[PDB]
DNA sequence: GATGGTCCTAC
DNA sequence: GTAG
DNA sequence: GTCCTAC
C-alpha cells in the first residue's frame, strides 16, 4: 500500500514544513509502512490513496497542523430541548435555572474537550525528548504515541483524560492490536493515575502538578492574545 | 456457531421469564443463528459459550432485564478540577458560579443518558407492533433493533440521540457490517431527523411530537409513583 | 461524511 | 475491566 | 448510554 520510497518522500516533505519535525515524521511513516492497516484515512478522500506520494505530503502538513496551538470558540451547538425537560421534571432543577444550566453545561463540554487536547500536548512536550513520538494529525488509527523499544519492537499508546472516557464501542478499536491505553483521572474515586504512565521516564517527568502548570501556561498565553486583540479593536 | 435447535431452546427459556416476549426473543435467536458473529459475548463466561443452550437461557433473563424501567440517581462522580479552571480562566465563568456549573453539568450529563434510554423505549413501543424487534439486553453487538424487510432480508439498526453521538472510534464498530445507524437531533442545525428513520413504518409512526408525548407521560407516571 | 476530543450507568 |  | 471540533 505504501510506495517504495515513502521514507524519502516523507523526509523531503517534512524538511519543507518543519525540519525539526522531520526525524519524528519519518519514523511515523516507517511505523505506517510496516503497519499499513494502522494508517487512518485522510479526512476527505478515499482509502486507496493511503500510502501514495500525495498522502505523504498531505500528512506532513496535517502532522504539523496537529501541533499548532488551538484556541477554540465556545460551542454554538443547538441545545436538545428534551435535556431541559429531564433536568426539570426528573432531577427537579427549577425552571428558572434551566437557561444557565444549558449554558454552563455547554461551556463545561467545551472545557473538557480543551482538557483532552492539552493533555496530549503536555505529555508530548515531556516524553518526545525521551524518544517517544507524538502521532499528531490523526495519522495512526487509535494511537497517540509510538516508541521503538529496546528489542526493536514498536510500542503504541492511546491516552484518555478519564477511566470512563470510552464506551464498549470506542474501546473495541484496540481489539486485535497491541495498543496500550492510559488515562489521567478517576471518575468514582479521588487522585490521579500519573505514576502508572508507561515507561520509567514517563513516570518521573509527568505529574498532575506538571499538567496543571502546562494548562496555566496555555491560559496565560490566551489572556495575552485576548489583551493584544482587545487593544487592536479598542485603542 | 449456534446450536441447531436454538429457536426451541429460546422459546422454552423465555417461557420461564416472560411468555409475552417469547416470540420476539425467539426471532432474535433466529437472527443470531443466521448472523452468529453479531452475538455479543456474555459477561461471566468465555467467547466460545456463544450459541449454546446455557447462553440462550441466560440471554432470556438479560433480554427481559433490558426492558426494566431505569430510575438512576443523580451522578455522584468526582469532578475533574481542570474543567473548572478552564471554565473560569478560558470561558470567563465567574469563580462563585463554578460550584453550580459543576452540579448542573453533572445533572445535564445524567439527563442526556436518560434521553437516549427513553428514545430507545419510545421507538420500541411504536415499532415492535410493526414486526421490528427491540434487541433489549444487548444480545446483538452494536445493534438496537432488527427487522425482516419487505424483501425478506434481515436488517439491523443502531439508534443514537444525535448526529455527533459517536466519534471515529465508536462509529468503526459497524465497519464490515451491514448495520445501519439513525440519529434523532442535529447539533448544528434546527429541526429533527425523524422522517429519515429507516422503513416506511418508522417514518410514518415516529416523530418529535410523539417522542415528547411519550417522555411527558413517562415522567408524570414516576411523579405519580413518588406521589404514592 | 470522515478523522479526532469528551463524560455517565449498570454488571 | 466490560456490555451500554 | 451521552456531546463537541476540525477537515
Ligand atoms: Ca488521538
Ligand atoms: Ca487520545
Ligand atoms: Ca443499545
Ligand atoms: Ca443505541
Ligand atoms: Ca458529555
Author numbering:
A (entry chain A): 4 to 238
B (entry chain B): 4 to 231
Task: Paste lines from the article.
AvaII from the filamentous cyanobacterium Anabaena variabilis has attracted our interest because it exhibits robust activity against the RNA and DNA strands of an RNA/DNA heteroduplex. As most other enzymes with such properties, AvaII is a Type II restriction endonuclease predicted to belong to the PD-(D/E)XK superfamily. The enzyme is specific for DNA with the G↓GWCC sequence (where W stands for an A or T base of a ‘weak’ base pair) and cleaves it to products with three nucleotide long 5′-overhangs. The core of the AvaII protomer adopts the same conformation in all three structures, and consists of the characteristic αββββ motif of the PD-(D/E)XK endonucleases.
A ‘closed’ conformation is observed in the complex of AvaII with partially cleaved dsDNA. In the closed complex, the DNA is bound to the enzyme by a set of base specific as well as backbone interactions. Moreover, the catalytic sites are optimally positioned in the close vicinity of the partially cleaved phosphoester bonds. We therefore interpret this complex as specific. In contrast, dsDNA was partially cleaved, due to either trace amounts of Mg2+ ions in the crystallization mix (resulting from reagent impurities), or the presence of Ca2+ ions and the long time for crystallization (9 months). In the specific complex of AvaII with dsDNA, the attacking water molecule (hydroxide ion) is either partially or fully incorporated into the reaction product. To our surprise, instead of an amino acid in this region, we found density for a central octahedrally coordinated atom with six solvent molecule ligands. Ligand locations and distances of around 2.2 Å suggested that the ion should be interpreted as Ca2+. Irrespective of the physiological identity of the metal ion, it is likely responsible for the preference for W over S in the central position. In summary, we conclude that there is strong evidence that AvaII binds dsDNA in the A-like conformation.
